[PDB]
Symmetry: C5
Subunit: 376 residues, 5 copies
């Protein structure tokens, strides 16, 4: 992920113009190769027309260029790109939202699975580890980066997400389908056991655990679905064909023709199709947006940092359910205990935010007349 | 389903251009027949104009071609295609999301319906089988592929989703409406029985089971609704008529006219309407997107693999609630038990993902001044 | 509702072209009258120009036609139609989703309201009848079809949804507002009574019943809201005015002018504005989409089959909570009891769906190198 | 709110054309003043050109008109209007959905807060009154109509939503922020008290009450958010500037020029810019859609009937929790008790809806062949 | 936030035209600098052409201007702006909706955490303070304004959101990741403790608290996600490049050429590109919409008032759970106790809202015929 939120935090002269100078995750990095290819084909045609063709071949080439220019219709292609890329961007954000995060589970497990002893620690850590393990199994199934981190289940074991006994059980399960869900069933069984032993003190707690389990497992499943059900291939081929047809029409019809021929709209020879090149950059980059986002789980600059998320999730969940279990600071009176109201101070750099009238609602400046406000 | 996620995983020179070479699920496979028909009509008209018509008939044909060219307006047709196809694509994804999946139920059933004995196994397996049976009943009602797998209820019985006693009960139910919901009521009754016998140990557990039951049953119902309430036929006819009218206007107005007549924009005879053909491919393919997706439950390449999902769901649910019931590996200390932090290693092929600064939030490089940070 | 899902199940040569031959629910059925009116006005103007006007009046008419042609701008009108019709279509689908369906309630009631005796039957049937009654009350308030089935509350009583004692209570309730919600309060009171008597065995069950009650009642309320809050009238008038202005501009500016006058783009007299007629069909039909969908509860071909849904819902709910209460087939071992795996067979017509590789995830063909997969 | 659902219930010749004759809530009512202003400016310019300017000033005016006509680009302005107005319309519907309605609470309170005595009545009525009071407080904060009904808290008290003791408590609360939430906290405290006294019989009931409380309170909060966070002012200014720039370009460039000058596309002097006027009506009305909907809580014709909703909600909630508490008709056998099936009759005016085949699913006419249906 | 809801409350002559006069949060404030730069470049080119270039250089400049004018295509750029800005606006609203608000928690805590004593006060205040503290930690991570208010954790402590003992615990937690979630785990542990001591009286109450905790914590997490996952940089660069390319094409191709040269569409020299300037204002402002909204957590006029929300949330939560705990006014009969119906009065300024017929549903004016309403 290429984060540039800090760069667009507060209004700056130029707006996004400053973002135009970024390389990592940039259109330039993604598009320079194709740009040069388009320019090379264009310049090869121009060179042929300028230095190879006979006079008659030149007149015919001019006829072809003029005819082809009529078909460089950016309107429809703009329509299709807009709709298709918007679909892809929305799908990409939804996928990111389907990443399984243990925070909700870790809150519930810290609050409901009890015991300072080793057995209670084992329960809490094992439940969170099962969640992380389901996450790892699915992510290695859908993400190139995570897979290359865990190319085999042996790696998952050596990395500590799965124990050896667990792998024996996992492997003996006779299923030809992806087993990412297996740790979630392990979680359910362990939670039921914890309740039976009384580590979970009430049935409502066990219900809360199972609910959050299924929220987490549902996110894992959603990741599988997004990996499996691509954007319809036919649609992608359609949009690509539209774009490439536009580029063909442009690479022929944007040729600079001899001004001495006096053709309409061919009076200036620039030798370099500057505006055609900018148009190519715009439209090809627009499609590149979809090309980047259609599979966000790779090793690219702006792909999701899935391995980072795995590390963070495991470390934080372990801390939450083990180090922080039943380790509160003593209840003490807060700074505003004796204060009827409460407002933390402001720094000198922020006190200006004050003195802005406190919004109460849009109606509170109407100033109605007396006789009008009398009840019937 | 034609999965091509692996092909668009990491940025590749050309982007989708590589997808243009795919046959299964492709625009080419879906469109070649119509393409050839359009070309045949176009070439028949051209042949008539070139070799049959008298001189006067040729002048009149030229007048008609010029007049018809004015009406080949791809702008509006692009609008309508964009909006309509987007609606269809969104509906298609929503339908896929309404496929009933037992994973949530199987987690709950593994965690809440107890007993290693045969009776407990019977309870768990029967509940999951009822879920799968509702799924089969609805899918055979809405999916051509599943129906051809289960053309009669006898097939459902022989396949083991419904027992003989159950079919007697199912058939005696006097209802003229689709009975896919019947196993969900069976599920509810059986769950209540399991609670009464104490196999379900608490009321909160029975509530969780019934909640997940209704989530699953609601997905089944949603499938029925999507099958029943088509995209409004009037809308589909409107978009089709717009497209075909464009194709008529093009098949006449894109004829190559005799350059010797010196008509404006008719100076080059290519004999093959290359750009018109590409435009036809683009627009007809764009509509084909909707045509493919409007009913995703058939036997086409990119239709949902419903029978595969049935197999997977049944096998996995059975495993989860029967083989994996109360079969945990012993609680054991994990690899990171004694480690204050925790981070699994990286493979040599992935360690580069490290050393990327750990994102903490966009504000954490601001570097405010000392006097500014003093509280008021 | 005009269901055509079966027609677009599997890819067919022509795609939607086959749908163009449908009459029920079709654009033709909805639009022929207006089409003929447009053609009649057009032909009346043409007849006047051809056979009534003096020479000078003809020159002036030609000037007017040429001027009016400049204003037949289908671009903006396409924009507004796209956005407005899309809003209407989405609203229409949301409305359909707000139809109250008893299936969830019937599952809960079958599972939670107990007793094979007459009193238990009375409880279950009465709860489901109250749900159906709320549905009937709201549907008769928002649907012309349902209202004409139940033009008075007396009809509701004679149809059995409301008893005589209930109507006395219903009518004595002093409320000037729509009383569709009254049976939902009756439901809540009866459920509380059932719990008090122990017919509902636990508080979590009563909570589940009340939750599903409010889901159902919320759907009823949503139907009321959709009936009350139209699409803003101003918006509808705006889109209609845009469309009609286009049609005026076309009915004047698409007149065939005398070719002997030699006006630009007026060289061919077809006597019939074929492409103008197709354009009218397209655009007027596009708006007709909204016109049909804006109120989906009437007696039209593609309106929702609300009366059918009432019949189905009542019959199915009654069956579920009465005939099927506590009437399970004996628990018996399933066909796959002794099978470690499980897969139902395939018919000869479907076995081809097999042998397609079982999708495990997009990463599982990467084939990493040995030294790359070593952990750091 | 201007309800016109009944007018568009069933297909009618002309479709929306009949809606064009409506005045209340209409584009005409909202736009006539601006229309006349545009026409007045246009006619003032035309009068100057026709009767004031010298010959040279006329040639220069003609040059200006021709130049200005090039910039009347309705395409982009159509784009921006489409996107912006769609955003506003969606926001408007979401706001309406955030109106707090007591129906869910009243169902729960009727079902869970017990006692026919005066104390039980006090509990139920007071809880519902607290909900209504929160609704009133927020609505008077966000709605001009409601505020003018309750310009001061004294009005709220005299209207009975807040008692005198409650106002003392409400006013003594030292908070500079809007206090609409205070009755929701009162509700929570009272509910906890009711449970403590046993008026609420179980903890699951109290939980249901608090859940529905927070749903209601969340809707109130959402109303505050929509009131506070306008559509970004910059966006609104952008769209307005685009529209007005188009109107400037049109008011100059749509001037009728002297045909004797023989300028291209200026050959007919109509003296009245009919199509320009229709275009103004269309585009200005399109923006008026947003202008009407951007704040739906005023006293306009099509603003939400917030005061009506207050009246209805209070009356209905009071009836539901007080008059209808524990006042069921005796459980009695329904009309279909002895009937295996069940279907209410149809009126002569609706029986035609019958005989339409009962939809069972799209697959149930496939008619597979015998040998194909054999299992492998 | 620049609230202008009160200005667009009721229809006003001109509609948004009055908003065009606003400075704070306005397009003018955001765009004047760029506007002047565009005008300066344009005027520098014009000055060069008018006063520096030789005659031949002038003919060549004219050729360049004419060629460049062909490429000022506002159509596609309008498409891309529409789609991209709409995505940004929707994301902005979603972000605002992810702001963590304690109101739901404070309702639950006031209702479920009991005791008038100091210990009960400590429990309630500490739980709400933990929620506020998580909110502060995340907001200082994602918001420039909040960060500059709390540049260091020491500020958080001195402001009273975190105690000294809590900071010791917070700092000793060995985690390299953002710790905003830590107070939510503290909350869970404290809630479990409160239940264990009986301050929380039932398990369903503790479950409700933990559910609302995770709703709140999920909002905090969502804020982190929105801060981290920018709108894809490639997309932003694409849209910016499209816009700037249009501005380049305009700054050259909108030059006023010498009318004495008699070029087509260059007959009037205005010296100031009025319409080009308006177009620049429109399009650049349209992009500015996204530029403003892409990061809404800064110190700009229309950024979210995050510090205000912190103050309000803390003060209100403290009041709700401490001052207002178990402090109800005595249950008393309401004004409408003895009234069968109930309707609060109207002010003279609002009674007109009455006499509008009370909407009962769209069907209730149909007036069916007698023989038609007979049941079959
Ligand atoms: C115009 C279309 C063709 C573009 C051709 C490629 C652009 C220029 C080649 C740059 C080579 C890689 C730069 C690099 O290796 O440098 C990485 C560095 C930090 O990466 P970061 O910027 O993501 O942080 O960035 C930098 O030095 C800043 C990189 C410079 C930005 C490119 C400007 C393009 C022209 C604007 C119009
Ligand atoms: C071109 C615009 C003007 C159209 C004028 C009206 C169209 C022709 C008149 C048909 C009269 C009613 C047909 C009918 O009463 O027949 C119902 C029958 C079953 O109804 P169903 O098809 O819904 O099943 O359908 C049928 O016979 C099939 C009906 C024929 C389809 C119409 C084809 C229009 C031309 C295509 C271009
Ligand atoms: C064309 C653009 C300029 C329009 C200028 C204003 C339109 C005509 C002035 C009408 C005065 C107010 C009518 C009125 O005070 O009457 C209210 C009455 C019931 O109100 P309601 O119709 O909402 O029910 O409605 C009626 O008499 C029906 C009102 C007549 C509808 C207006 C037709 C416009 C031309 C169509 C093209
Ligand atoms: Cl619960």
């Amino acid at each position: 992920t290429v984060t540039y939120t800090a760069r667009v935090a507060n209004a700056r002269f130029g707006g996004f113009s400053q973002l135009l100078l970024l390389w990592r995750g940039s259109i330039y990095k993604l598009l320079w190769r194709e740009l040069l290819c388009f320019l090379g084909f264009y310049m090869a045609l121009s060179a042929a027309y300028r230095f190879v063709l006979t006079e008659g071949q030149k007149r015919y080439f001019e006829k072809l260029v003029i005819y082809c220019d009529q078909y460089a219709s950016l309107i429809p292609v703009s329509f299709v790109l807009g709709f298709y890329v918007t679909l892809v961007v929305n799908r990409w954000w939804s996928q990111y939202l389907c990443m399984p995060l243990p925070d909700a589970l870790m809150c519930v497990v810290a609050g409901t699975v009890h015991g300072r002893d080793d057995r209670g620690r084992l329960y809490r850590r094992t439940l969170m580890r099962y969640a992380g393990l389901s996450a790892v199994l699915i992510l290695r199934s859908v993400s190139t980066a995570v897979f290359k981190r865990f190319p085999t289940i042996d790696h998952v074991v050596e990395a500590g997400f799965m124990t050896r006994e667990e792998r024996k059980k996992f492997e003996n399960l006779n299923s030809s389908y992806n087993k990412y869900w297996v740790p979630c069933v392990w979680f359910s069984n362990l939670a039921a056991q914890a309740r039976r032993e009384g580590r979970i003190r009430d049935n409502s707690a066990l219900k809360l655990l199972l609910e959050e389990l299924n929220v987490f497992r549902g996110k894992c499943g959603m990741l599988f679905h997004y990996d499996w059900i691509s954007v319809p291939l036919v649609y992608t081929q359609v949009v690509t064909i539209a774009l490439y047809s536009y580029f063909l029409a442009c690479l022929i019809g944007r040729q600079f023709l001899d001004p001495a021929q006096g053709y309409k709209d061919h009076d200036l020879d620039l030798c370099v199709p500057i505006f055609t090149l900018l148009q190519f950059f715009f439209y090809a980059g627009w499609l590149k947006v979809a090309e980047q986002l259609i599979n966000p789980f790779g090793e690219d600059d702006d792909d999701f940092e899935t391995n980072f998320l795995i590390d963070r999730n495991f470390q934080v969940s372990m801390l939450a359910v083990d180090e922080m279990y039943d380790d509160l600071a003593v209840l003490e009176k807060d700074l505003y205990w004796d204060a009827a109201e409460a407002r933390a101070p402001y720094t000198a750099a922020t006190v200006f935010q004050l003195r802005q009238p406190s919004f109460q609602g849009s109606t509170f400046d109407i100033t109605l007349a007396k006789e009008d406000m009398q009840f019937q």
